[model samples]
Target: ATFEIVNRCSYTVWAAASKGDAALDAGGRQLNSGESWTINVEPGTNGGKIWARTDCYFDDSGSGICKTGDCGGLLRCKRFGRPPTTLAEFSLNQYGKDYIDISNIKGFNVPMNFSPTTRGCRGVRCAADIVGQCPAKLKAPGGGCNDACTVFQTSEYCCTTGKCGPTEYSRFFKRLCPDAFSYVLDKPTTVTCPGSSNYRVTFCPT
Candidate 1:
């Protein structure tokens, strides 16, 4: 399931924490309105506490761009002129798409029902634009396709546009998810899990 929160008052800092329950044993922490961070309560652990603050409740944003108390999570840091906003939540064993925009609430299943903000955030368009180049036949050096092909072969392809066939799109899986048996965009790429087949490894991109 997805997770999301609403910024009822457009505050600068919004925090969310997770705790293990009877069905799931996990804890995670996230801060909205600034750079994102991750803290985990290991599996089988319980009663973990994650919170957020507008001031430097956690560590300072690291670079001069972040005043001692100017921001909260990844969004704020990106706004503060930092390279690739580092979300603490990203470091945990958890893996998924980049978090965009700011609201409140935490946990893996938080629901999102609204559009995202534009500033200091990356939306679907970023990936869509790059993937768009994968289709259509055009002269080389004048398009998004790789130049390895002949100048006008027009046989080149990319997965995004479906011009390259399944195999070419599979390359994207290999490049993007090295450990997975298969990959897909805008969602978690499936990796080797319990009781998988050895042939799965062979089919995966090298």
Candidate 2:
């Protein structure tokens, strides 16, 4: 399958893909405003995590910390980035099917649209001003918005155990983007599609 990651933001976005053990696009690439990066996912490549880091500066060796969505502070991330990052996650060849979802559970740094380019499958557009409208208690140090669980660290927000319910904070995010994963254990937001479908993820989508 092929995945296209597009950036339409006013500023630069460092895109990273941590899919299985294979680091697509050398794990990361710099995308200027209006630029788009495409990645090909070979069959049986497991799943993927795609995110954009903001306000980052790396030296020639590719080592630096991003204001948000930092993964090991490296240009080529070998791990999942930290929280308060808008995310595009997907699973291919999952029991003969494919799945994709947008996650606000880690909080949100930017607006994102995750969708299928082929097939008549559903897509999720988590395009919301979450960072600006974030609750005061859940705002990150820099630009992103923190999830309730990250702020309160409570079962009501985290679902640490097997069962949990929505808090006012979770509902706050849920109210903003119904198709995105507002909190842990959030259901019904994931889109199940055919294995043959290709995907696209857009940042600051129009």
Candidate 3:
């Protein structure tokens, strides 16, 4: 299958993707507003994630920094990006279907939408302006909204143990991005489609 990463926002965004033992072409490449990059995915690709990095500064060797979603200060990420990033998660051809979602459980820096490009598949999106209205306590340093767990770091916020549920902080995120994973315990964030579908992931779909 293939996934198209589209940039619909008004600013430049650096798109990034990662999958175990699978190499991503231009994993951290600049996408001008209205541009898009398509990536091929092998069958049964699992634990794949795509996100965007903003306000980045990189040198000739692809070494530098990003204001948000920096993966160890490298242009191409060898690991998952830092928290407070909006993520598009997927597991293709898993159990005869494709599971996907736009996750903000680690917090959100940008709005995102994930949908199958093929017909007859329902799309899921979480395009709320999170940075503009982020709660005071959960606000990130550069920009973006941090998850309650990132800020508080308590079992209550992290859901490290016991049967945990949403708190007021998590509810705040949930209210804006209802389709996203607001906290570790969020349950309604996942969507499933036929395995034969190709996905279109857009940043700032609005």
Candidate 4:
């Protein structure tokens, strides 16, 4: 499948995508407002992630910092992203089906719209103002909203049991990111598309 990473954000975003151990697009690229990048998901790619890093500055040597989604603090990501980063995840060519979702398992930094360009299927969107509406207790350092467990690191938010699995704090995030991960115990919000489907990962989508 082909994935298009589009930036409709008012500000610049350092777009990042990864599969297994490999980083696509040198792990990250500077995407100014209205810019876009594309990647191909080969057969062996099976599953991977896509996200945006905010407030990043990388030197020519590819070393720097990002307010969110830092991958080894490098311009090219050699690792999975850090927490509080909104994610678009997918698994392809699995039993003749492809699975996709917008994950809040980490947290929220950007509003995302992930959908197949192929018709007859619907897209999953998380366009809420979570950062602005974040609970004070669950706020990240950069002012992005945090997941319950992300801030508390508890079994409750970790989905160890029902009572706490979907805590009010997490539910607040869930209510906004309906198609995203509410909690670990939360059911799979992952939806499917045909293996050959092309995808769009739009940032700050309207």
Candidate 5:
């Protein structure tokens, strides 16, 4: 699916979408002083816009804000052609009124970042009877790196020989640790990934 950039502000804004730190072919470019653009992306991989450039505020002031994609942000990854799921929602206050309740707000009042969670990794189908496997059948036909021995019941997946088999509960882990790696407890062990050491495992019933 695709969406067009809507320039509601009096001044123009520059924007781009991406799958990673790198830019995507369809999203990165400078938007006109008041122009919009269409963006298309793969369903499962991380995808979102980077509002890197901006014009003067409606008041003609020279101030501008920089917006970049956030890790574990929006993307078209779930099965059945659904849009990205919302992990959390909050209201923004402008002039003492929440922005969500106002109309005709301008200049990207809310900045959004894009990227994927470790457990929220796209393109893999979780195997059956496994704790973290995707509940939905995935577009990736063979199911990413299926391996019975590698199945995990906890919040992490094992990466053997440089490749981790499809996840068992990656989605659940995403909600539990939206800001960190999903498999801090299992293979590709947290101890080895020094940056992730001290990472705590998310609690789950299964």
Candidate 6:
């Protein structure tokens, strides 16, 4: 399996990926506009995620800062990005199928699209123009919008302890990208693809 990371935006995007204990392929790379990077994943890889960081500045040592989606200020991320980041998550060859989704439950910094390269699988995307229209209360300091849970940290928003439903905040995200994860308990966000299929994840897919 592989993930082709494409940058369709007009500016640079620092792409990052995390694959648990497995060694990451091209885990950190600066992708200019219209550029793409392919990361090879082993067939049974699980708990993997990819995302783009914007407005980043890095030195020769690969240490710097990003306005959004900063992963401990490291160019190569060993963990998940910070909140307010758009994420493409996957678990390949799990059980009988592959599970994938474009998630905003952590929040969104850039629009994203995740698609299967082969036939017989449906694609999923969250291409909404979120930053420009982000609600004032959910706005992040640098850019992007924060998920209700990130801002409130409540059980009702985070769904930490018990069953929880949508809130006005989650509804705001749902209204824009109904197929993407808008909150913690959002069960309908995932899409199942055939195991071992190749996938593409694009940033700023507008």
Most TM-score-accurate candidate: 6
**Tens digit per residue, CA lDDT, model 2, 47-163:** 688999999999999999998888888888778788888888887888888888988888899899988999868889988788878899999988799998878888778888859
Shift of residue 136 alpha carbon in model 1, Å? 68
* Least well predicted 10-residue stretch by lDDT in candidate 2: 39-48
- Global lDDT scores for all candidate models: 0.24, 0.84, 0.86, 0.83, 0.27, 0.87
Give the count of colliding residue pairs in each prediction: 17, 0, 0, 0, 10, 0
**Backbone clash tally (model 1):** 17
- lDDT tens string, model 5, 1-206? 33344443344444434434544444344455446565544332332223323221221332232232122222321111111111111121223321111000011121222222222222111112222343333211222211222243222244335455335444343333333233323322111111111111101102
> Each prediction's TM-score against the native?
0.18, 0.94, 0.94, 0.93, 0.27, 0.96
lDDT of 4 by residue, 50-159 (tens): 88999999998989999899888987776778778888988877887788888887889889999898865678999999889888888897747777777876777776
Q: Which 10-residue span in candidate 3 carries the lowest summed lDDT?
A: 19-28
| Candidate number of the best lDDT | 6
Off by over 4 Å in 1: 1-9, 14-41, 57-206
Better of 2 and 6 by TM-score: 6
lDDT of 1 at 172: 43
Candidate 3 is scored at a TM of: 0.94
TM-score of model number 6: 0.96
User: What RMSD does model 1 have?
Assistant: 17.7
Residue-by-residue lDDT tens digits, candidate 6, 78-197? 777887888888999998789888888889998999999986788899998988889999999888899999998899999988689999999989989998988878767788899888
Displacement of the residue 131 alpha carbon in candidate 6, Å: 0.9
Q: For model 1, how does the per-residue alpha-carbon lDDT over 1-206 read when each residue is reduced to its tens digit? A: 22232222233333333331211112222343433332222332223222222222343544221211123233222122111111112112233223322111111111122222223322211111222443343212222322212223334321234344333443442343332222123233222211211110000011
Question: What stretches of model 3 exceed 4 Å from their correct place?
Answer: 20-23
In the predicted model 2, the residue pairs found to clash are: none
